[PDB]
Amino acid sequence: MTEYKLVVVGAGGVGKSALTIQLIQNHFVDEYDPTIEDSYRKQVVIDGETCLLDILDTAGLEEYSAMRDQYMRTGEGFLCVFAINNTKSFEDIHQYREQIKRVKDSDDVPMVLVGNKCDLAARTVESRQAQDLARSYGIPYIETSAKTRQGVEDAFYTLVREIRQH
Ligand SMILES: Nc1nc2c(ncn2[C@@H]2O[C@H](COP(=O)(O)OP(=O)(O)NP(=O)(O)O)[C@@H](O)[C@H]2O)c(=O)[nH]1
Ligand SMILES: [Mg+2]
């Protein structure tokens, strides 16, 4: 069983926890709304191979976290999350990517750009603008909704596949 260390990053309120919880939930607990950074596990079959995903749900750069740098050093792939109704969260993406490049000292870190809250009509970030940004980084772009579950599995499994193809 191959293990993968994934890190979910992005501005406050974009849905980092909602995404993580939606992927890892075994549903015993009805509602889980995390208030703190934490690590979660999910065993899943991706392309025949049993994988163990360790998913770290991180705080936005606005919050202090002592272990942030070691989180990046450890992390093997990164979900870079913004919300399609929050232009500022989208502009903030450059900060998340620079931090990862600075800590890991590499241009070629596995990453997926994630446009969350795609269930909402009040869109301020056009899909094509986010496609252009991902293309400039050389990474996949996937839109997700943590409410409907749309794209949630696809975003994490694409990140895994990015790690493998690295
Ligand atoms: N409509 C909609 N709301 C969402 C979606 N994902 C999360 N939310 C909502 O957006 C808010 C923030 O979600 P949350 O998961 O806490 O985001 P976060 O990035 O972990 N926040 P924090 O940085 O403070 O930890 C919550 O009210 C949550 O229910 C989504 O896909 N669609
Ligand atoms: Mg959170």
> Which domains does the chain possess?
1-166 (3.40.50.300)
Identify whether the C-beta of residue 13 lies closer than 8 Å to the C-beta of residue 61.
no
Q: Which two tokens stand for residue 9?
A: 């990053």
- DSSP three-state, residue 65: coil
CA distance 7 to 163: 12
- How many residues does this entry show for the chain? 166
Give the closest ligand to the alpha carbon of residue 34.
2
Strand blocks (E) in the chain: 2-9, 38-46, 49-57, 77-83, 111-116, 141-143
Q: Which of 116, 118, 150 gets mutated to test ligand 1 (max ligand atoms within 8 A of its CB)?
A: 116
| Nearest CA among 24, 145, 147, 160 for reference residue 79 | 160
Q: Whose CA is nearest to atom 12 of ligand 1?
A: 13
- DSSP three-state, residue 164: helix
- DSSP three-state, residue 50: strand
Q: Which two tokens stand for residue 41?
A: 């596990």
Tell me if 122 is assigned to a ligand binding site. Answer: no
Tell me if 147 is assigned to a ligand binding site. Answer: yes
Q: How far is the CA of 51 from the centre of ligand 2 (A)?
A: 24
Q: How far is the CA of 59 from the centre of ligand 2 (A)?
A: 6
Resolution (A): 2.3
- DSSP three-state, residue 53: strand
- β-strand pairing of 2-9 with 49-57: parallel
What technique determined this structure? X-ray
CA distance 81 to 92: 10
Q: Which ligand 1 atom is at minimum distance from the Cα of 146?
A: 31
CA distance 32 to 65: 22
